[PDB]
Each structure stands twice: as C-alpha cells, then as structure tokens.
C-alpha cells in the first residue's frame with residue numbers, strides 16, 4: 001500500500017455564538033454554500049485530515065467530538081480517528097484523520113496563547129495543533145482575535161503575540177517561530193477584521209451584498225488592507241473571497257444582517273464583515289492548492305456562518321537509505337557561495353548563521369560574517385565562500401530535492417536571532433551554482449534579506 005505524495009485537508013472555522021449547533025452540519029464538511037464550493041461528484045470522497053476551529057463554543061469536548069464524528073461518518077461512511085483536541089476558554093481545535101493515517105501521524109503537539117493584559121486577558125487568544133505526517137510537518141492555529149471595528153491594531157498585536165508564544169512543532173528549531181516550523185501552516189479563526197466603511201453606509205453595504213457585488217466591500221476589508229501594508233500575516237496566502245460577509249447575522253435565518261448598536265454589543269455597530277478566515281503559509285516550492293473557500297448558507301444557530309476551506313497539500317515519505325538516518329551520506333553536500341544578509345538593524349554586533357534542517361543530523365553554526373555599510377544606510381553581512389559545507393543524512397535526489405534549509409542570522413554578542421528565513425532545495429539543476437533568496441523576518445516582521453548562490457550535490 002504506497003505512501004501518499006498528496007493529501008487533502010479540510011479547514012473549518014465557526015464562531016458558534018455560544019449556541020448549540022443545529023442537528024445537521026454536513027454542508028460545512030462538504031464545502032457547500034457560497035463562494036468557491038466543492039463539486040457534488042466529490043461528496044463521498046473523504047478528506048485525509050479535518051481540522052475544525054470553533055470560537056464561542058458552548059459544548060464540551062465530548063459533545064462536539066460526537067457531533068463531528070457522526071457528521072463525517074454520515075458523509076463518508078468512515079469512522080475518523082481523533083488526532084488531537086485542545087480548548088482554551090471557548091476557543092477549540094479538533095483534528096480528525098482517516099484511520100489509515102493513524103501510523104503516519106506522530107509528534108502531536110498542542111498549545112494555546114492568551115492575548116491581552118488585565119481587562120483584555122480572559123477570553124481571546126489561540127489554540128493550535130502540530131504533527132508530522134510521514135516526512136511532512138503540519139501546523140494549525142485557530143485564533144479568536146480582539147473584536148470591534150476600531151481595534152485593527154490590537155488584532156495585529158494579538159497576531160504577533162500568538163506567533164511569538166505558541167509553542168508547536170520541533171523545539172530544537174529554537175530560533176524559529178511557528179511561521180517557519182512547518183512544511184504547511186494553516187491559520188484560521190474569527191480574526192475579527194471588519195469592512196471599514198462609515199456606519200451611515202450600512203444599508204448601502206447590505207444592498208451590495210444582496211447584489212453579490214463584493215468588490216467595493218473587499219477593498220475596505222481590514223485584513224486585506226493590513227496585509228497589503230505588511231502590518232500582519234506577512235508571507236501568508238488567502239484564497240480570493242467570493243462569499244458574502246459571514247458576520248453579523250440575525251440568528252435562525254440568513255436573510256438579515258444585524259448591524260445596529262445595542263446594549264448587548266456595547267453600543268457598537270457591527271457592519272457586515274468577513275470576520276471568519278483561513279490563511280496558510282507553506283515552504284517554498286511545496287505543492288499547496290486551495291480547492292474550496294466559502295461559507296455555509298443553511299447553518300443559522302450563530303450570528304456567524306461557518307467557513308470552510310480545503311487544500312491539496314504535498315507530502316513526502318519517511319525516507320530510509322543504507323546510510324541515513326543514523327549517519328551522513330558522503331555522496332550528498334550543500335554549498336553556499338557568495339552569500340550575504342542585508343539587515344534593517346542599527347546594531348553593529350558581528351553576526352553568524354545557523355542552518356537547520358531535518359536533512360541534517362543537527363543544526364550547523366557558521367563563522368561570523370564581514371559587516372559592511374550598504375549605500376542607503378543598511379547593514380550588509382558578507383559570508384563569502386566561508387560558509388560550512390552541509391552534509392545531508394541522505395544523498396538520494398528523490399529525497400534531497402524535496403528538503404528545505406531554515407536560516408537564522410544571530411548576534412555574536414547576544415545569540416539572539418535578528419532574522420529567520422527558508423531556502424528550498426527544489427533546484428533547477430544539481431552540481432550547478434544557482435541563485436537563492438529568502439526574506440528574513442523576526443517576530444513575523446520583515447528584518448532583512450538573505451541571498452547568494454547554492455550548489456547541491458546528490459547521488460545522481
């Protein structure tokens with residue numbers, strides 16, 4: 001029975017509005033409703049992995065698991081295995097997988113982050129799950145960010161706290177946050193970004209929604225504008241939105257948006273918004289294709305509609321050779337030529353690199369680089385041809401060309417990372433000097449760039 005080179009992943013996010021669900025929620029898992037929807041001919045084909053994020057979830061873990069499993073069993077006639085479940089307050093994540101994957105999944109981690117301080121600590125934050133699926137690392141984050149149209153900068157701060165402090169994936173990747181630890185990272189939830197238009201325009205917005213004319217609304221969506229301005233979710237992708245705003249509905253219908261200020265809302269307006277979102281970030285040149293992104297039309301217990309997204313995702317096998325794992329394969333090597341880091345820092349410490357990869361027995365520290373002044377004020381750290389030759393555990397090109405090298409540039413004075421990035425080994429040629437490039441980030445913000453050339457030797 002061959003190991004897969006692709007899987008499909010279902011991501012759901014639903015703010016349940018503290019109400020129990022209706023008796024039937026199958027439309028959610030079938031990607032049916034509005035937006036980019038799944039073809040009917042696929043309805044009985046199970047996804048490999050289902051990741052369900054809820055917010056304002058009033059159910060126990062047991063109660064929700066029973067509903068989810070019975071829902072999937074009805075669609076697919078498969079009894080899914082529970083990989084992980086984790087709840088912070090009323091924010092929950094459930095991962096379910098086909099039983100045939102049970103012995104492909106390992107290294108399961110869960111964590112949560114509570115956002116805010118005093119007043120603002122006690123209901124918002126995030127939960128996450130990570131695991132290995134054969135040779136591929138997968139991370140999943142469900143966040144419930146700060147509410148309210150005038151709090152976009154708080155949401156952005158919530159995002160940075162979650163990616164700094166959520167402890168998932170391989171703890172040996174010490175310089176790297178969750179935005180670098182996984183082959184594929186899915187980040188979803190009630191992100192709570194709003195359509196930034198005047199309150200007076202509420203009825204005009206409703207009109208536009210009834211006409212399925214979303215362009216003049218999406219151009220004011222805070223998440224799209226903040227992402228464009230590099231304020232949040234740097235280097236994440238989102239499918240185009242082609243479904244109506246998923247908040248704020250009158251319960252028990254979808255015919256009415258409930259936007260007007262009420263005592264129950266703290267006298268705040270809730271103009272129709274795309275609060276409920278799915279984004280992802282995958283390592284360079286790894287297959288990932290969004291095959292659905294939409295909202296259900298028939299689940300009406302909450303003031304939000306559920307959102308679904310599904311993905312094809314490339315996966316790799318747990319590779320064994322005669323040599324690695326447990327030794328190097330002298331027929332393999334990775335060389336960096338003429339490499340330099342450009343850093344936004346004002347600091348004047350010396351810097352060194354660390355190379356981390358599961359194709360290495362352990363991470364590799366470089367010598368210090370040579371600091372020069374860039375023309376437009378910046379720090380350029382030159383490595384020349386000084387970088388250590390990396391010795392992969394396996395030389396087979398079917399394995400090595402699918403790997404990645406994480407790079408951290410660290411201060412010699414403090415050993416703190418000033419920037420992290422990632423280089424794919426999925427090269428156009430072996431035994432050939434080829435350009436490489438990654439942006440560098442720290443705490444998920446842009447801090448610089450790393451560029452140079454690579455020369456990869458495989459057994460072929």
Ligand SMILES: Cc1ccccc1CNc1nnnn1C
Nearest residue numbers: 026040041042043044074075076
């Ligand atoms: C509503 C539902 C529930 C469980 C499984 C499938 C479906 C809809 N799919 C379907 N019905 N007839 N043909 N097809 C493709």
